[PDB]
C-alpha cells in the first residue's frame, strides 16, 4: 500500500489546499450522486477527500463484541473528492465558484463569484 | 529452406449433355 502513503517533505505530509471549508454547504458537482446538497463535516486535507453528511452510503459490517455477540451492522458515509463540490446558499440556491475580497476592514474572505453572498460569514 | 506456395488456377466446368455419338457404334 506504500504506493499511497501521505507524501512527506522532510518529516511532514504535504497538505494540498482546498477551496472547501468545514461547515460548508455544498452541491455535489458530478460524481455519481450528482446534484445533491450537503453539509461537509470532516476534511481530509491531504487527499482532498471530504465527507458531506447523509449522502454517500456505504454498507459496512462490524464484529461488535469479544464473544461474537451483537456485531450488528453500521452504515458509514465515506469520502468524496473535493473537485466534485461547489457552494450553495439557501438564498441564492445555486452552485457557484469561490472568489475573494478584502472588505472595508483588514480581513479577506470568500465571495461567491456568480452571486453577492459571502461564504465566510461571521467568524463563528 | 524455401517456404513457397502455389495456386494452380483451375476451372470448374459443369457438363450439360453429350451429342453425336451415333456413328460407328462398337457397343455389343
Amino acid at each position: 500500500r506504500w504506493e499511497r502513503k501521505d507524501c512527506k517533505p522532510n518529516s511532514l505530509p504535504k497538505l494540498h489546499k482546498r477551496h472547501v471549508k468545514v461547515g460548508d454547504t455544498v452541491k455535489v458537482i458530478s460524481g455519481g450522486e450528482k446534484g445533491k446538497i450537503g453539509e461537509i463535516s470532516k476534511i481530509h486535507k491531504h487527499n482532498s477527500t471530504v465527507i458531506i453528511k447523509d449522502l454517500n452510503f456505504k454498507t459496512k459490517h462490524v464484529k461488535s463484541k469479544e464473544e461474537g455477540e451483537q456485531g450488528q451492522i453500521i452504515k458509514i458515509e465515506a469520502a468524496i473528492h473535493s473537485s466534485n463540490v461547489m457552494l450553495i446558499l439557501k438564498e441564492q440556491e445555486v452552485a457557484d465558484r469561490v472568489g475573494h475580497k478584502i472588505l472595508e476592514d483588514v480581513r479577506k474572505v470568500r465571495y461567491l463569484i456568480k452571486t453577492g453572498e459571502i461564504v465566510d460569514t461571521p467568524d463563528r | 529452406r524455401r517456404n513457397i506456395g502455389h495456386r494452380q488456377p483451375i476451372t470448374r466446368i459443369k457438363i450439360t449433355g453429350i451429342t453425336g455419338y451415333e456413328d460407328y457404334p462398337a457397343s455389343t
Binding site: - | 529452406r1 462398337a26 457397343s27 455389343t28
Partner: protein, 115 residues
C-alpha cells in the same frame, strides 16, 4: 531504447497449430515443433511426386489383372501391342478405371482391340 518483442508468440503459435495430431512431444514442445514442421513439409513433397508415380503403378496392376482374366495368355504387355497398333488415343490407364466400374464396356474395348 528497449525494443523487446512478442512477435515470437505468433511466429510460433502458428506452427504450434500446424503440428496438431502429432502424437508425442511433437505436438507440444515448441523447439521440436519446429523441426517436425519442416519434416512434414518435406514428406509432403516426396509423397506428392511419389503419388503420381504410385498411382500409375496401381492402375498398371489393376488393368493388368482385368486383362489376364481372359484365361489365355494375354498381358498388360501385349494389350499394348494391340492397343496402339489400332489407333486409340491413349485411354491413359483410366481404362483401368472403367475396368472396375463398367466391366462390360472394358470387354467391349478389349474385343475391338483383338480385331
Amino acid at each position: 531504447r528497449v525494443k523487446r518483442g512478442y512477435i515470437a508468440r505468433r511466429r510460433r503459435k502458428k506452427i504450434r497449430f500446424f503440428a496438431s495430431s502429432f502424437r508425442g512431444a511433437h505436438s507440444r514442445l515448441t523447439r521440436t515443433i519446429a523441426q517436425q514442421k519442416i519434416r512434414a513439409l518435406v514428406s509432403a513433397h516426396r509423397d506428392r511426386d511419389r503419388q503420381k508415380r504410385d498411382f500409375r503403378r496401381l492402375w498398371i496392376t489393376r488393368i493388368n489383372a482385368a486383362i489376364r482374366e481372359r484365361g489365355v495368355y494375354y498381358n498388360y504387355s501385349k494389350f499394348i501391342h494391340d492397343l496402339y497398333k489400332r489407333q486409340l488415343l491413349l485411354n491413359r490407364k483410366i481404362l483401368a478405371q472403367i475396368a472396375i466400374l463398367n466391366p462390360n464396356c472394358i470387354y467391349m474395348i478389349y474385343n475391338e482391340i483383338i480385331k
